[PDB]
Amino acid sequence: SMNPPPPETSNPNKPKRQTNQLQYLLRVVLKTLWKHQFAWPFQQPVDAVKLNLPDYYKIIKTPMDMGTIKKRLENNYYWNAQECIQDFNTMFTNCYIYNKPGDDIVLMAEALEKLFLQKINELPTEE
Numbered sequence: 634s635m636n637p638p639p640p641e642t643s644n645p646n647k648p649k650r651q652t653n654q655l656q657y658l659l660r661v662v663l664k665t666l667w668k669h670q671f672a673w674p675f676q677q678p679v680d681a682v683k684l685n686l687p688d689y690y691k692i693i694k695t696p697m698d699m700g701t702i703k704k705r706l707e708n709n710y711y712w713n714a715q716e717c718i719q720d721f722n723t724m725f726t727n728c729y730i731y732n733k734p735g736d737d738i739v740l741m742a743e744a745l746e747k748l749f750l751q752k753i754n755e756l757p758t759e760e
């Protein structure tokens with residue numbers, strides 16, 4: 634099998650803006666999730682070849698991961714905060730689609746997802 638190319642992270646033709654929400658998403662939400670003990674399986678795309686998961690990208694057609702989200706924020710890929718939040722949600726959902734209740738990775742996703750909701754809770758207001 635093969636991995637797909639990673640999701641796009643920097644589009645120089647898209648318009649760019651810096652908002653308090655986008656800065657919060659990178660410096661508070663992402664950063665705190667990134668440094669969690671269980672972040673490491675979510676910091677880059679699932680390498681289905683190295684992990685020997687030949688069905689991964691047969692089942693998961695909208696892959697996402699925190700490495701991609703990080704790069705997207707750093708490169709102003711997101712205009713709206715909701716695009717970023719959607720990517721996080723996609724990342725977690727993928728995990729629950731592919732994996733079984735009680736799997737280590739599922740428990741790790743639950744931890745990160747709880748912490749995510751804690752942090753988005755205090756997201757600054759929209760301009």
Ligand SMILES: Cc1cc(-c2nc(Cl)cn2CC2CCOCC2)cn(C)c1=O
Nearest residue numbers: 673674675679684686728731732737738
């Ligand atoms: C199926 C799958 C694998 C991995 C993944 N990335 C790395 Cl690096 C290692 N692993 C697999 C182990 C991670 C620690 O728990 C045990 C499985 C990540 N995600 C989100 C998945 O859905």
